[PDB]
Amino acid sequence: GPGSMKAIQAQSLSGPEGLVYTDVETPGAGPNVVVVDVKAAGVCFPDYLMTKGEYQLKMEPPFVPGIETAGVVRSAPEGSGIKPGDRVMAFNFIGGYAERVAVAPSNILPTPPQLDDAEAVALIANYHTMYFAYARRGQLRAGETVLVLGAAGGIGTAAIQIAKGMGAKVIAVVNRTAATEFVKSVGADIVLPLEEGWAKAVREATGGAGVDMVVDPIGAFDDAVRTLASEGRLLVVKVNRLLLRNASLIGVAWGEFLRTHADYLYETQAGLEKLVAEGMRPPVSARIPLSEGRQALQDFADGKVYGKMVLVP
């Protein structure tokens, strides 16, 4: 028989309340799978949505949530170039909140040696998404100014550190004013609260010229457009007015892009490895035992997480 491992398993679509720490089948080696011993499992917004049956893909219980993992390879096929003992990052649609995960060889990336496993898992959804958003979709340039909305969340934090890494100036808006110092510490040049008149304050902070780019992981929207310079661009990571002027709304759908451009992943990993070499360290605000995954996910849903939270098996 296959043997069992601990995992958090959604046993209903009731959200975090339906999550149970329980025993499940241990994945098993196979000629086209890489099994990873999980040292850190990322908590992301899709995971949470999946627990409520509100994610674009509806998984039916029972299922182990978790898209993002980092740990140590246990097994891998010949010729994959992956070996037992390798420190790797992994992604899949499910299975992350577990002691081990089985994933396709194409879904494995080498962990940057400067990072621990929590910092490495933190790169997976949020940093690759934002590298892609900046490098491919929005064509960010050194010296431009970027407005980051929802700035203390997972995507926002990656959006700050990567923009700073690429030589941009960053204005961050926070809807949670208790995150102001956190956001400043991540490297935002100017932090502003999301209150009446914030769009006008963003403009004034740029000497009236507006920002070159807006990152919007929230959807507060027509106000965002108002902050844009001529030929500025807003990345949605929507009702559009006559205030669009010579601005662009830039759709960002990383998962979908990756489906048809799998080799771009080598470029996003290389870009991130360089940013990490140069000193970027993804902030990890909480590392919660896997056994306490229900409470971890509830805290995430209640809006308590700055940067990235991980579960530790």
Whether residue 110 contacts residue 82, with contact meaning beta carbons closer than 8 Å, is answered with no
Task: Please state how this structure was obtained.
Answer: X-ray
- For tokens 């960010």, the residue is 140
Tell me which H or E stretch contains 131.
helix 128-132
- Was domain 126-281 assigned CATH 3.40.50.1700? no
Packing angle, helices 264-277 and 154-165, rounded to 10: 70
CB proximity list for 255: less than 8 A, separation 6 or greater: none
* Alpha-carbon gap, residue 286 to 308, rounded angstroms: 7
Tokens (6 digits) for 17:
């309340």
φ, ψ of residue 4 to 5 degrees: the values are: -125, 160
Every domain of the chain with CATH number 3.40.50.720 lies at 126-281
CB atoms within 10 A of CB 62: 13
CATH topology of domain 6-125+282-313: Quinone Oxidoreductase; Chain A, domain 1 (3.90.180)
Whether the Cβ atoms of residue 21 and residue 293 lie closer than 8 Å to each other: yes
Name which of 89, 87, 105 is nearest 41 in CA terms.
Answer: 89
The torsion angle over the Cα atoms of residues 289, 295, 298 and 304, rounded to 10 degrees, is -70
Q: Where do the DSSP E strands lie in the chain?
A: 4-10, 19-25, 34-42, 68-75, 87-91, 100-103, 108-110, 145-148, 169-174, 190-193, 211-216, 228-236, 248-251, 284-289, 308-312
Q: What is the resolution of this structure in A?
A: 2.1
* Ranges for all domains in the chain classified under CATH 3.90.180.10: 6-125+282-313
Q: Are 176 and 303 in contact (CB under 8 A)?
A: yes
